[PDB]
Structure 1
Amino acid sequence: LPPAPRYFQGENTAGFMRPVRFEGDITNLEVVGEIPKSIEGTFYRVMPEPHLPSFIPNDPWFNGDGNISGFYFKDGHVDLKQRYVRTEKFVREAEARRSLLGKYRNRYTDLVEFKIRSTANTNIVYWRGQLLALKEDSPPYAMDPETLETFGVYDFDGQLPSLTFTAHPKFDPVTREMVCFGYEAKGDGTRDICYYSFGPDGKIAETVWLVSPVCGMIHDFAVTENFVIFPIIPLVCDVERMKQGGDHWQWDYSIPMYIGVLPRRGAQGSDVKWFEAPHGFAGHVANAFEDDKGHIQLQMAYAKDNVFFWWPDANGKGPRPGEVEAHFANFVLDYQSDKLPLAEPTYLVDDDMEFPRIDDRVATRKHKHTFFCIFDRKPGVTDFEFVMPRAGGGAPMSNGLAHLNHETGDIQRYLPGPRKLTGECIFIPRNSEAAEGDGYVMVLLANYEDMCSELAVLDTKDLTNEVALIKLPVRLRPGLHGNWVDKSDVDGHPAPL
């Protein structure tokens, strides 16, 4: 077999990116300041964290085993519990004591035949009493919210219609539906998208099969009262290339950024309209809603070139690390229109941004607050000379959070400091009467001075100030998505505004 290295090597596992690979508990975390005593619930986040050194050199960050962190808050105290998802990959590699799964989303490079290739490393959501650990090439893995035990692959009591389940399902705060999809839904390189939903009782509601114009990556989507919307990143899959050992994804400079719009209820697959936005990268969706004319306002991070530069075009062409910025865009779509080409979007702020969150009590409806990561190159915001040699590679950098009030246009910015970077934030309503966007924001920090992680708690009344800074004595490697599950919410999700 290709040799099994016995320590980590390469930039993707160097410095702050070096895997720790711990599972267990650290209770009664150290706190500077004071955690508001009324906060009660759990912040769950997932990170890619290779459990064994890869036989693939420079294996991308996206291919690392999912490790789940839970931060359990009560009466101003906080405990950490941490555990790897027991994927098929995790278990078989643990039994063998060596890596067996090969290249990202390329089964032809695996050393054994896997049934499920999930790393379950991209999002961790709450649904009907379980956590669901998500990875867009796979069904979810179900887990226990209290112990982080893995129950196994989850197929929704045999109802799951698709091979694949998106990392970005949406929770309708009014209907309590979980609205879902999968792309490549019939296997590697397929153009099949399966759109499907579940009612709060767990029964499947929608199931619609549609066809994408290209086999492109649909990482995120959007949901409004009457529509679902599929923005396609111009990374394209050819299974014949994969059979020869090639990459699953390859950029295509010749295509638009497709944005499909389908009626949310009762549609057939031929009802989808593939609108054509100017060529660019479809980043995360903040939220979408229908305005008073019935037009879709789609607000999302949007870049003009390939953010995932390690998967360049057919001729190896694309940008370098740190070159491509993404911006907070508003696209207007009208399902009634037969005009496919769309105008350049308008931009809500100027910051290089990503990982937008809203108050999910207005998800799918008009929102007026967004919280997001920023990367500010302004001199002195990040001490790059100190940070970069300690940082490793392979993951995006964020050196602050911003809060946009969409009514007033005011922006507040949280800067953790010159030798700290942030992950994706979560928003927590102050209480069940709180107005939209009023409450607390939490965000994990990488402290490059200590080479430790910290968890910051902010009040939305003044985002610039830490009310509490929770000081971890270990590193939590840069991660992907996370969510708050409030103790006062019976189904784990907040009540509609």
Structure 2
Amino acid sequence: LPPAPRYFQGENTAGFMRPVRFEGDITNLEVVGEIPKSIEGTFYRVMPEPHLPSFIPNDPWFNGDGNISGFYFKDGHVDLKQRYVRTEKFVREAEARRSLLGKYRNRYTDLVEFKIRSTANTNIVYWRGQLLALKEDSPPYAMDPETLETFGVYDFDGQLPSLTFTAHPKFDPVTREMVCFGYEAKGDGTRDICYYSFGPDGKIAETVWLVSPVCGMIHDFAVTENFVIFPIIPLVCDVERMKQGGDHWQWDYSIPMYIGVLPRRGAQGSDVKWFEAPHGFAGHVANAFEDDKGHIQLQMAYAKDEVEAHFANFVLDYQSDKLPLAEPTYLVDDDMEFPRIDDRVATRKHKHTFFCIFDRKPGVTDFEFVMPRAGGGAPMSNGLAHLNHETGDIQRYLPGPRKLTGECIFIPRNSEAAEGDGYVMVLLANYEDMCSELAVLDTKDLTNEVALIKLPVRLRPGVHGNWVDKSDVDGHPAPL
């Protein structure tokens, strides 16, 4: 076997990116200010954090084993629980005490044969009394919301029709359905997309097989009352390249940003229309909804070719036979990503969005101090913004010149709160202290920290996270 290094080396594991690899508990986290006493629930977030040094030099950040953080809030107190997902990779590498899984999404570089290659390191969502730890090349891993014990790879009682499960399922607040898909749904380099949904009784509802015009990355999707929408990133998979030891993904300058529209209920695969947005990068979906003309308003981060994407509105008409789309309109000027809405209006008209920004205004980030301490290979964000879509008012939270942010969560103030009224939480990297902090903001004034929770350790830059409110028996908020 290629030798297993006994310590981490290279930019992906330097400074703030150095793996900690802790599993366990820190109760009674230190707090500056006051956590509102009525907040009750858990903030779950996932970070890639390699458990063992990779035998692959400069293994990318996005290949790291999924480590789940839960912040448990009650009566103005907060406790941390942290545990690795017991993926096949994690379990087999822990038993061997060395790395065995190879390059990102290239099984031809693995030192042993894996059934499931998931690092479960992209998203952590709640479904019917379990957490689902998500990686778009794999089924979910089911976990206990209270103990963070791993139950195992989850196939929804043998109903899962796809080899793959998106990191970005949508929760319909009216129907209580989890709306899902997988791309490369029949394995490496396949153009198969499987669209499927689960009702609140846990039974599969939709299953539709459709065909992508290229084997492209479909990272995120959008759901409206009557449609599901598949934006394709121009990253394209060739299995022949992989068999020679090459990358799963390669950028294709020549192709549009395809946006597939499929009827949400009772469709065949041939019903998909592959609209052609101008060449660019499909970032995260904020939300999509049908307007009173029945046209789809798709709001998502969009880049051409630190966060360098813009908050785009695409207008889609399923009835239109013209496949080429106009350039989108832009809702704000900011370099942005990681958009969140009040999920009580998901798949319907939203008028509040919260997102990460990278403000390049001189002085906002002390780059001279931060860059030599930051390591490499994770998105950077130096603030949050709140857009009111009705008034056009924007509030910006800037944590400080020596701090960066992850993706935020939104918490309704209570079950009677107006859309976008409540609290925002976001994990900060404090490069001064080389510690993580959890900031609690009131949506009445996003510029002010109501509480700053001071972790005694670093949490590596992570990916997605979700709020599970104690008032919601099914873990998801009630519709507005």
Instruction: Give TM-score scaled by structure 1 length.
Output: 0.96
CA separation of 1:63/1:239 partners in 2, compared to 1, >3 Å: closer, same or farther? same
Task: Tell me if the contact between 2:306 and 2:379 (Cα under 8 Å) persists in the aligned partners.
Answer: no
Query: Retained in 2: the 8 A contact 1:400–1:414?
Result: yes
Q: The residue matched to 1:293 in structure 2 has which SS? A: coil
Is the Cα–Cα contact under 8 Å of residues 280 and 306 in structure 1 kept in the other structure? no
Farther-moved stretch of structure 1 (55-64 vs 452-461): 55-64
In 2, are the aligned partners of 1:63 and 1:104 still within 8 Å (CA)? yes
**C-alpha separation in 1, matches of 2:416 and 2:197:** 29
Q: Indicate conservation of the 8 Å contact 1:399/1:421, yes or no.
A: yes
Quote the Cα distance in structure 2 between the aligned partners of 1:187 and 1:62: 20
Distance in 2 separating the partners of 1:472 and 1:213: 47
Q: State the match for 2:364 in structure 1.
A: 381
Task: Encode CA deviations 1:82-127: one digit per residue, 9 max, x unaligned.
Answer: 0000000000000011000000000000000000000000000000
In 1, the alpha carbon distance for the partners of 2:359 and 2:92 equals 42
Q: Offset of 1:292 from its aligned partner?
A: 0.4
Identity %, equivalent residues: 100
Flag as ranges the 4+ runs of structure 1 deviating above 6 A. Answer: none
Contact (CA 8 Å) 2:306, 2:381: kept in 1 or not? no
Please give the alpha-carbon distance, in whole angstroms, between the structure 2 residues aligned to 1:279 and 1:412. Answer: 31
Shift, 1:156, TM fit: 0.2
Secondary structure at the counterpart of residue 292 of structure 1: coil
- Tell me the distance in 1 between the aligned counterparts of 2:203 and 2:53: 41
Partner of residue 381, structure 2: 398
- Look up the match of 1:339: 322
Q: Does the residue aligned with 1:331 lie in a helix, a strand or coil?
A: strand
Q: Any idea what the Cα deviations from partners look like across 1:422-454, whole Å, max 9, x if unmatched?
A: 000000000000000000000000000000000
CA distance in 2, matches of 1:102, 1:76: 44
What is the CA–CA distance in structure 1 between the aligned matches of 2:404 and 2:3, rounded to whole Å? 35
Once the two structures are superposed, the pairs formed by residues 202-217 of structure 1 within 5 Å of their partners are 202-217=202-217
Report the Cα offset of residue 345 of structure 1.
0.2
Alpha-carbon contact 2:71-2:78 (below 8 Å) kept: yes
- Alignment CA distance shift 1:34-1:306 (3 Å): closer
Q: Distance in 2 between matches of 1:369 and 1:10?
A: 40
Distance 1:305 1:96 in 2: 42
2:2, 2:240 → 1: CA distance? 23
Contact residue 424 and residue 440 of structure 2 kept, 8 A: yes
Secondary structure, counterpart of 2:102 in structure 1? coil
Distance in 1 separating the partners of 2:98 and 2:337: 35
Q: Compute the displacement of 1:379 (Å).
A: 0.4
C-alpha distance in 1 between matches for 2:165 and 2:124:
12
- Matched with 1:320 is none
CA distance in structure 2 between the aligned counterparts of 1:490 and 1:300, rounded to whole angstroms: 30
- Aligned position for 1:483: 466
Task: Confirm whether residue 354 of structure 1 aligns to residue 337 of structure 2.
Answer: yes
Alignment of 1:141-152 (within 5 A): 141-152=141-152
Deviation at 1:306, TM superposition (A): 13
Contact kept, 8 Å, 2:334 with 2:357, in 1: the verdict is yes
Question: 1:185–1:192: 8 Å Cα contact kept in structure 2?
Answer: yes
Task: Show CA shifts across 1:312-369 (max 9, x none).
Answer: xxxxxxxxxxxxx100000000000000000000000000000000000000000000
Partner Cα separation in structure 1 for residue 397 and residue 306 of structure 2: 28
Matches within 5 A, 1:51-450: 51-305=51-305, 325-450=308-433
Alignment deviations for residues 244-292 of structure 1 (CA, whole Å, 9 cap, x no partner): 1000000000000000000000000000000000000000000000000
Q: Do the aligned partners of 2:173 and 2:345 also contact (CA within 8 Å) in 1?
A: yes
CA contact (8 A) 1:32 1:469 kept: yes
The RMSD of aligned alpha carbons is 0.8
Asked whether the 8 Å contact 1:281–1:306 carries over to 2, the reply is: no
Structure 2 counterpart SS, 1:339:
coil
Q: Deviations over 1:448-478 (max 9, x none)?
A: 0000000000000000000000000100000
Q: Residue in 2 aligned with 1:313?
A: none
Pairing of 1:26-65 with structure 2 (within 5 A): 26-65=26-65
Q: Do the aligned partners of 2:133 and 2:140 also contact (CA within 8 Å) in 1? A: yes
Q: Distance in 2 between matches of 1:10 and 1:337?
A: 51
Deviations 1:154-193 (A, max 9, x none): 0000000000000000000000000000000000000000
Residue 57 of structure 1: how far off its partner (Å): 1.3
Give yes or no for contact 2:47–2:68 (8 Å, CA) kept in 1: yes
Rounded Cα–Cα distance in structure 2 between residues aligned with 1:417 and 1:233 = 33
Q: 2:234 touches 2:280 (CA, 8 Å); kept in 1?
A: yes
- Measure the CA separation in 1 of the matches of 2:305 and 2:318: 27
Secondary structure of 1:90 counterpart: helix
Name the CA distance, whole Å, in 2 between partners of 1:63 and 1:170: 24
Cα distance in structure 2, aligned partners of 1:104 and 1:110: 10
Equivalence for 1:322: none
Q: How far is 1:3 from its partner?
A: 1.1
SS in 2 for 1:449: coil
CA distance in 2 between counterparts of 1:31 and 1:353 reads 29
Distance 2:299 2:468 in 1: 24
Cα distance in 1 for partners of 2:347, 2:382 equals 29
The whole-number CA distance in structure 1 between the counterparts of 2:11 and 2:198 is 41
How far off is 1:59 after superposition? 1.1
Give structure 1 stretches of 5+ with no counterpart. 308-324
CA shift, 1:305, in A, is: 1.8
In structure 2, C-alpha distance between the alignment counterparts of 1:280 and 1:64, rounded to whole Å: 27
Q: Cα deviation per residue 1:460-497 (whole Å; 9 max; x = unaligned)?
A: 00000000000001000000000000000010000000
* Paired residues of 1:251 and 1:306 also in contact (CA < 8 A): no
What do the CA deviations read for 1:49-82 (whole angstroms, capped 9, x no partner)? Answer: 0000011111111110000000000000000000
Checking the alignment, whether the CA contact within 8 Å between 1:404 and 1:411 is kept in structure 2 is yes
Q: TM-score, normalised by structure 2?
A: 1.00
Work out the CA distance in 2 between the residues paired with 1:80 and 1:417: 24
| Secondary structure at 2:311 match in 1 | strand
